[PDB]
Design a protein around this ligand. Structure first.
Ligand SMILES: NC(=O)c1ccc[n+]([C@@H]2O[C@H](COP(=O)([O-])OP(=O)(O)OC[C@H]3O[C@@H](n4cnc5c(N)ncnc54)[C@H](OP(=O)(O)O)[C@@H]3O)[C@@H](O)[C@H]2O)c1
Ligand SMILES: NC(=O)c1ccc[n+]([C@@H]2O[C@H](COP(=O)([O-])OP(=O)(O)OC[C@H]3O[C@@H](n4cnc5c(N)ncnc54)[C@H](OP(=O)(O)O)[C@@H]3O)[C@@H](O)[C@H]2O)c1
Ligand SMILES: NC(=O)c1ccc[n+]([C@@H]2O[C@H](COP(=O)([O-])OP(=O)(O)OC[C@H]3O[C@@H](n4cnc5c(N)ncnc54)[C@H](OP(=O)(O)O)[C@@H]3O)[C@@H](O)[C@H]2O)c1
Ligand SMILES: NC(=O)c1ccc[n+]([C@@H]2O[C@H](COP(=O)([O-])OP(=O)(O)OC[C@H]3O[C@@H](n4cnc5c(N)ncnc54)[C@H](OP(=O)(O)O)[C@@H]3O)[C@@H](O)[C@H]2O)c1
Ligand SMILES: COC(=O)C1CCN(C(=O)c2ccc(NCc3cnc4nc(N)nc(N)c4n3)cc2)CC1
Ligand SMILES: COC(=O)C1CCN(C(=O)c2ccc(NCc3cnc4nc(N)nc(N)c4n3)cc2)CC1
Ligand SMILES: COC(=O)C1CCN(C(=O)c2ccc(NCc3cnc4nc(N)nc(N)c4n3)cc2)CC1
Ligand SMILES: COC(=O)C1CCN(C(=O)c2ccc(NCc3cnc4nc(N)nc(N)c4n3)cc2)CC1
Lengths: 273, 263, 259, 273
């Protein structure tokens, strides 16, 4: 009877803020994580403490690789598609529903054209394309099938899919090609899924941050200079300044919106060198 | 500290729903109208009944023309006077919604009406907005930083569908392209004053039953209908809320996936 | 012998476009506003290489009234431009909307008349004159009996690669270019049945009158005039006959940059 | 002395016309193919007949799969390896590669929604993404590497990369999600590679057809019905109407253009339902 949100990469930063923002609205939240088990279980505890049985954690590698079956007798590697189906399944198993999907998990590191390895280049392609593009596709598919399979009478009235894209990829970041192409893929998914799932009343939108919760592992004057180029406030956003938009888009007040993106970027994309 | 919204073309349809939506969030509302005096006054009455002194009306032709006093008055002056009306009455203006807009054909293919059409469609949709944003920014720049609002917001009502131009509506389409440029340019220049500038583009919203009505309706992917006024205004209201304080220079399409379509 | 009308033809890109079209065989109507000397000299060069292959026509393209029956509107001056082509050579196959004022209209200081002249000048040259010119052009074609019509009608609007990344203080200019982009799309749709193609070409930084230069990813300079005009010429060629309603950025990657 | 173009999926339709159009401008042309051996060899023969040693054919599956071991004896060949060998082929035979056209592309439905069912699935993802996006990336990588490796004194003066994108993908075709995502990934690559390869004076641009040489495998009236939708001419383009734009972009006349797309669609993207 309570709406259910699945949030990938939910353990920290903008994914946490999204899970939290949805939770404040009344959602039960499936918190996905890959490597951040401690932070995800802690976040779950906070949410459950405020409202019993309003959170769970599920672990999955969203890289475009087949994982190992759980080396022994009777099985076959688990495809990304299956791990994605199981994520959505986790929501139906536990709460009997899934109303909101947020595709937030994403790897982000350089793949330069101009310059051990083989494994680097192979793994990077799978990981960056998986997390940013191919997993969202399969996740959206599982999500869609399970609404299609729900008798109209038992269906939700506010199905929403949010894809976290990037406001800045038309102005690409030097050396981040695979990432950038993956976000471009994700933007196509938004449009194409919004079109094909319209008859089911599944809305599909994007939210593209500019600079948000900027990692500060660098000279302060450099961190500071990066920041200062956002026209608005001359700083990166907080997590909530992004997650609040995600929340609105999922609200029944946004039910005519589909197939679109909202940049949250402090006018950063308006800039030129 | 009641914040003040100026909404152009506020008397009916989407402008009314925006005035109402902002009113419900606590704004005092300057309702601009041109010809729809009766409807604007009635709406002001509703809002004032709910909350005393929370609404006024001001009349202005937003066409790019000079008018008379019975000095012809230029569009720039009428625009400045709109923003000034807000300061005179409540001593502030926090929100501006550029909503008023003419919309009729200017076919390229089968000089009196040509020029008045140009002035009207360009003025309402583009030039008046520019002047309004100018007046708005000047009043803020002139307010000592101590006494400034904390959530200045300008929303331009654009069009989701103008990349897929409506046949025979060239001037209108160009004016909306001009408005999109104003959104980006104003968002950049006013950032240092923390004035956010965004657009909202409806697709098909609140169709008068021109008969065919079912024709257009039926190729909106989402729901196969046009939107209600609130389905648009709610987005406007969000964009004006402090929760949307990192958003500037951008547009939100409210079109039910309509722009995703092809012939 | 096809005819091109080129607004703002006296110097810089307008001149390189006139020249580039002339080298392809076009007769060229060179429009100018103030640059009479330069336009007449250019016309002399072109006529010397090929007799009667160029003329000059003067018009303020600002959205004002000027000079006489009674005040002459922008619409009329625009019609007269296209008419000059038909009168002299009995045709007009290519239109290039190139003429364009470009100067600041700040929202924040750092009155009035300067603003109401600026509005009419920047919107007129960049957007309103183009519309009327496109209108005049389309009517002359619609009125030509089909068997007597050209086979490669082309309109090119000079837009701006960089206006999604607005130049600080240039709001009316930017809005006018956004207006011109809509004209491109709208005219391309409505004139398709007459086989009039309508496209845009957007320079980044071209022929600067260096800080800015060094910011361009490709070559770290501004373009030459020909680096822009050659694109225009291609779009006008029969090889480009399936292209309409689109823009080409000629910007050296400049619009790919961020601050 | 003679500039060299590599054209992927060159055997037929738009890729043949591109190879032909480059050939007419003086290029030697590496014509890659996958399943169309006969057409590619026949096209090579025409080009060689017209100008001796001005064409070669080379075969590669550009699907994102590992392939042809040394019956085997050993290790699987990576897509990246096959891609590098394509560009290598050009250097081995003619000592250069000036132009790369990423034209090969698979195109068939991947519906979100229902009514070889997971090999099909898996092979669709690798094939659509591979041909349309991942192989282009690796090809662009190999190409840039060989230029970077060329002493500036032995470097060509007109290096050009063209990615065949799609004018219509912002108006997505119902049921072709993966294809659409893949083209959005290719658009990312265009922008990103244009930025990163600028310092080596490698230009990187896209050309997006609307409807070109439309397959007529359907009731005439339905075929006529589809073309009739194009506002310009009410027909699909010919192959040359597309390839001539490609050729222009590669010409020295286009040397200031990089990081952009050119729609060749007859105004088709300007339409709405
Ligand atoms: N922050 C920004 O300035 C910014 C800017 C533009 C766009 N965005 C987009 O906004 C979203 C959120 O931003 P963010 O900064 O919060 O993201 P983030 O901190 O970089 O990480 C998001 C989460 O994604 C998960 N992830 C990465 N690769 C994965 C894989 N192979 N399999 C499963 N999960 C994987 C990680 O989960 P675990 O820790 O559990 O392993 C990570 O915690 C991302 O999609 C991002 O690309 C962010
Ligand atoms: N409705 C849609 O499907 C749709 C679609 C795309 C975009 N939009 C945009 O959304 C906004 C609102 O849509 P709408 O249908 O509610 O608007 P609307 O009914 O067509 O008109 C809005 C108001 O604009 C005022 N107006 C028109 N010309 C004016 C002028 N010369 N001077 C001063 N006021 C003038 C009129 O005020 P008076 O009645 O007082 O004279 C009119 O009531 C418009 O900007 C529109 O372009 C709407
Ligand atoms: N150069 C660049 O870096 C750049 C960048 C982006 C876009 N563009 C676009 O490309 C085009 C050409 O650029 P450009 O630098 O060569 O242009 P430009 O030198 O600034 O000026 C073009 C011509 O426009 C004419 N003009 C200006 N105002 C006019 C008016 N009111 N009525 C009639 N003519 C008027 C002038 O003609 P007269 O001299 O005869 O008076 C001028 O020579 C322009 O549309 C421009 O916006 C250029
Ligand atoms: N035709 C159109 O209306 C249209 C519209 C929009 C965009 N485009 C784009 O323009 C380009 C050309 O159009 P087109 O219609 O000529 O293309 P096409 O006929 O469908 O096929 C292009 C070639 O791609 C090759 N290819 C497909 N999958 C491959 C793979 N897994 N590995 C290696 N090669 C593979 C095929 O080569 P083999 O035959 O040798 O196996 C095929 O002949 C494509 O990128 C397309 O996306 C075309
Ligand atoms: C080779 O390295 C370089 O050339 C630069 C890359 C940019 N750089 C940065 O510090 C930096 C970090 C984040 C930037 N963008 C914000 C962003 C975008 N997308 C993201 N996606 C995910 N998944 N996670 C993020 N944190 C993220 N951040 C931009 C620049 C310094 C070194
Ligand atoms: C020459 O006439 C024609 O070719 C068509 C034009 C489209 N048509 C319509 O009924 C129609 C009406 C509104 C349409 N768009 C919605 C829209 C967009 N912008 C607007 N702006 C303002 N200011 N007001 C509106 N109502 C408005 N509506 C699209 C088609 C039938 C006749
Ligand atoms: C208030 O002044 C300023 O803030 C800056 C404005 C930018 N500036 C420049 O030197 C400058 C000049 C041209 C620039 N863009 C190229 C451009 C774009 N459009 C044009 N349109 C026309 N019609 N003519 C041009 N020359 C032109 N140039 C960008 C920056 C220094 C001072
Ligand atoms: C599930 O099937 C359907 O719903 C429709 C799909 C569209 N359809 C078509 O006949 C069709 C064919 C090509 C269309 N687009 C042109 C196009 C775009 N990209 C392409 N890419 C490649 N690689 N090859 C092409 N031939 C190609 N064609 C659009 C519609 C009929 C059935």
């Amino acid at each position: 009877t309570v709406p259910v949100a699945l949030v990938t990469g939910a353990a920290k930063r903008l994914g946490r803020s999204i899970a939290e923002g949805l939770h404040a609205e009344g959602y039960a939240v499936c918190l996905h994580y890959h490597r951040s088990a401690a932070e995800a279980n802690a976040l779950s505890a906070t949410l459950n403490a405020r409202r019993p049985n309003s959170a769970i954690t599920v672990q999955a590698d969203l890289s475009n690789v087949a994982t190992a079956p759980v080396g022994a007798d009777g099985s076959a590697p688990v495809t990304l598609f299956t791990r994605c189906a199981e994520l959505v399944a986790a929501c139906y198993t536990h709460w009997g529903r899934c109303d909101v999907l947020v595709n937030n998990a994403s790897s982000f590191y350089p793949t330069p054209l101009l310059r051990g390895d083989r494994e680097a280049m192979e793994t990077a392609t799978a990981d960056l394309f998986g997390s940013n593009a191919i997993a969202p596709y399969f996740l959206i598919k599982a999500f869609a099938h399970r609404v299609a399979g729900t008798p109209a009478k038992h269906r939700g009235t506010n199905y929403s899919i949010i894809n976290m894209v990037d406001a800045m990829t038309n102005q690409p970041l030097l050396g981040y090609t695979i990432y950038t192409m993956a976000k471009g893929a994700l933007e196509g998914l938004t449009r194409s899924a919004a079109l094909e799932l319209a008859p089911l009343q599944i809305r599909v939108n994007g939210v593209g941050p500019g600079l948000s919760v900027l990692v500060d592992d660098m000279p302060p004057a450099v961190w500071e200079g990066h920041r200062s180029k956002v026209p608005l406030y001359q700083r990166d956003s907080s997590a909530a300044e992004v997650s609040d938009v995600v929340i609105f888009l999922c609200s029944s007040k946004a039910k005519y919106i589909t197939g679109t993106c909202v940049k949250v970027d402090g006018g950063y994309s308006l800039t030129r060198a």
